[PDB]
Amino acid sequence: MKSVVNDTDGIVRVAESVIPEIKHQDEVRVKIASSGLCGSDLPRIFKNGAHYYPITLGHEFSGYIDAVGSGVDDLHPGDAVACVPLLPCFTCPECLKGFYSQCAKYDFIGSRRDGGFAEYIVVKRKNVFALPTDMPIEDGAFIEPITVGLHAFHLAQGCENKNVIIIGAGTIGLLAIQCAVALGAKSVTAIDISSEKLALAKSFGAMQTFNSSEMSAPQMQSVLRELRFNQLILETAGVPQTVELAVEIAGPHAQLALVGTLHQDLHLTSATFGKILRKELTVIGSWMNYSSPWPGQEWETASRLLTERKLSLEPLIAHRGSFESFAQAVRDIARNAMPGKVLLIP
Amino acid sequence: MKSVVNDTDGIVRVAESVIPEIKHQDEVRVKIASSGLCGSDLPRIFKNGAHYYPITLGHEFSGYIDAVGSGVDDLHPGDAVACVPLLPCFTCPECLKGFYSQCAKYDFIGSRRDGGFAEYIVVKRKNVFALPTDMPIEDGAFIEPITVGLHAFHLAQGCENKNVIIIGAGTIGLLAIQCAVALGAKSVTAIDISSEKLALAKSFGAMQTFNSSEMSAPQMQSVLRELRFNQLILETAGVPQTVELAVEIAGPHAQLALVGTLHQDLHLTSATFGKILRKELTVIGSWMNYSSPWPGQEWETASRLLTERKLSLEPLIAHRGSFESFAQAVRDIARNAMPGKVLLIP
Ligand SMILES: [Zn+2]
Ligand SMILES: [Zn+2]
Ligand SMILES: [Zn+2]
Ligand SMILES: [Zn+2]
Ligand SMILES: [Zn+2]
């Protein structure tokens, strides 16, 4: 079978291996139909940021059950699934509290073990999420990234009647705009460095957009005056300039949800830090996308919103291709910005 | 009348001035009995951090009503009061929401206008808080710093049954320890560089203490293992090293309340920032100490805790004296750490 294998210093190749066998009663084998590249994969590919090399990535995928272990009774060959890539231990104090992403013994498909840029993969039953039979299988690759946004909204106790601000218009951020609209946000505003993913964001329902390469924080705050109350800001870009921007533009008692991981240090001026105090902001760390009961309401909500057509996935996709095509598309990214969702279609 | 006036390059003066007159129907004049130096006053004196010079500071004080304006019907000469130093406008959208410390137009006794390091002051009726008739008048000077800690606890929805960690053993931190014990924290841990402030913390009820000049963050986290859940951490020291420490030591889903204002920039590593997300911390900006109904339940709680003898103020006090000895005590601080509460007794 074919897979995409990444090696040290940004080398990407397509490799041939034997199909993995089911080795435990609670495992399943999935034949992968659609597998997306995450923003968080780019440092793994191009900045030696993976836990090991060589490695096969991919934690955003869907497929059909190919076989099941003898202990699996609720899934059958042919069933459509999405991958639930985190595997907590379920027995540490954190896990028994429902803090699965604070488990100090978890596995992660496409990060801590090999993942979904392959024709087949064997994973635990708890690592797959059943899809509605009428849902197009390709759509299932977006479930995991949808739940990223939904988890942050969950931590903030909802976005209903809130003025939400999404910073970053990558796939995660564009999905968060669509979810915010569908979950009854009073308004949605999008902010990003380049100018018309912002047009795309307006088509998804953002009532206004700020190009941060052309507006300063004060200019943005001035426009936001009428909407300065009951704010929920999601920082999805994961660069220190946007974290700083969120604090600067925030209105009184705004909730600020951090979902983007930084790969450079954050220097905040004394003044900016002071605004966290003076505005009495609530800064909410957000990690992964899970809650009890496993894998969490986020996952059922993601599937539900898709089926009732509240979400729009096609405009997000910058590329579909099989292995050679997808590999070169990944190579073409270089250390540049993500064009849109790059999908592997085996 | 005498007052303490500080000037540009850390000069502290005792000056003579005329007694201020009541000019509006809703004003009172207070003859000041006890007036304390806040940790936040030190950058105002020695790091040119005040809004203007020359200036008279002091926002932690108590006294007796000397005279009242013609429109004041519920206070009279001889009444004991504490100062409520913030004066919001009460007519902006922030104030109408009960967000008094975000008021666009607020005044502040001892920061935006001259304060209580004087024999008499004229302030609004809204700037004084009636004390119980049996309360020793000097105790009233501690009400404002008490409510600082209580406001942070309030923002965090209480400290009851929580494992609280107080970082910084200045007067405000030591008071927050006593309040935490009184309000039923499951445990209280104190952290500071002074082994002696730490002994005091234990006598106030801290079950353990970490000296940060001698212990590492990992060393601290190791000790905190059995208490790592349901944490409430108050950062009161207001220096970048302790903000960094709070994030490093925090347990899973800990609340982190920020009450100390920085006067130096904050440089967080990408790893330290990452912990905010990975631990799913909630960072709570805390500013001043007010709520609706003005000035807030915090002030009622402070008064009550004092009257039922749940707090201990005498060991906090490092100095008592009239104008000349108080001024020299202040000068002796220079650019060093606070010895304890320095009080002016006119
Ligand atoms: Zn991802
Ligand atoms: Zn676990
Ligand atoms: Zn103060
Ligand atoms: Zn106001
Ligand atoms: Zn720096």
XYZ file of C-alpha atoms in Angstrom, chain A residues 93-94 97-99 101-102 106 151 155 225 228-230 235 243 252-253 258-271 273-274 276-290, chain B residues 93-94 97 99 101-102 104 106 112 151 155 225 228-230 235 243 252-253 258-271 273-274 276-289:
98
model
C -7.114 11.238 37.438
C -7.253 13.742 34.567
C -12.367 14.084 35.336
C -13.029 14.303 31.605
C -9.803 16.231 31.003
C -6.391 16.407 26.503
C -4.530 16.749 29.819
C -2.160 9.728 25.461
C -14.340 23.059 21.619
C -15.030 26.325 26.896
C -17.117 50.353 19.425
C -17.451 46.059 22.122
C -19.641 44.252 24.658
C -20.070 40.493 25.088
C -7.094 33.447 18.080
C -2.218 37.290 20.220
C -14.650 45.269 28.200
C -14.833 41.822 29.799
C -6.520 30.772 22.395
C -6.444 27.886 19.941
C -3.352 28.708 17.865
C -0.050 27.279 19.125
C 2.921 29.685 19.068
C 6.259 28.756 17.519
C 7.973 32.001 18.495
C 8.183 33.656 21.909
C 5.517 36.155 22.931
C 6.763 39.560 24.068
C 3.959 41.691 25.486
C 4.646 45.282 26.435
C 3.816 46.337 29.966
C 0.967 48.380 28.461
C -0.372 43.107 29.545
C -2.001 45.852 31.591
C -5.658 42.210 30.178
C -6.117 43.534 33.706
C -7.776 46.853 32.892
C -10.356 45.337 30.520
C -10.804 42.435 32.943
C -10.454 39.971 30.056
C -10.914 36.243 30.419
C -8.215 34.382 28.513
C -9.229 30.783 27.823
C -6.589 28.246 26.898
C -8.008 25.735 24.455
C -6.415 22.384 23.671
C -7.605 19.777 21.182
C -11.284 18.967 20.900
C -12.719 16.484 23.359
C -22.585 52.125 28.890
C -19.811 50.454 30.950
C -23.552 47.534 33.054
C -18.444 47.684 34.807
C -13.519 49.916 36.610
C -13.849 50.115 32.820
C -14.314 55.856 30.290
C -13.376 57.829 36.057
C -5.778 60.743 38.981
C -12.686 41.104 43.880
C -14.289 37.121 39.344
C 0.846 17.096 42.508
C -3.180 20.053 41.238
C -6.954 20.109 40.595
C -9.421 22.963 41.208
C -0.589 36.646 40.994
C 3.461 35.703 36.000
C -5.000 21.214 34.864
C -7.832 23.711 34.220
C -3.944 38.498 37.656
C -4.061 41.327 40.168
C -0.487 42.616 40.052
C 0.180 45.323 37.493
C 3.449 44.996 35.581
C 5.855 47.917 35.248
C 8.197 45.838 33.151
C 7.490 44.044 29.848
C 6.531 40.341 29.877
C 8.556 37.919 27.743
C 7.009 34.448 27.658
C 8.706 31.558 25.889
C 6.739 29.652 23.263
C 6.773 26.660 25.628
C 2.672 30.216 26.353
C 1.929 26.705 25.091
C -1.675 28.100 28.859
C -3.325 26.167 26.028
C -2.163 22.663 26.911
C -3.318 23.000 30.529
C -6.520 24.766 29.367
C -5.957 27.514 31.907
C -8.375 30.316 32.462
C -6.497 33.568 32.939
C -8.627 36.174 34.704
C -7.699 39.854 34.500
C -8.634 41.616 37.709
C -8.860 45.408 37.956
C -9.548 47.418 41.101
C -12.292 46.236 43.355
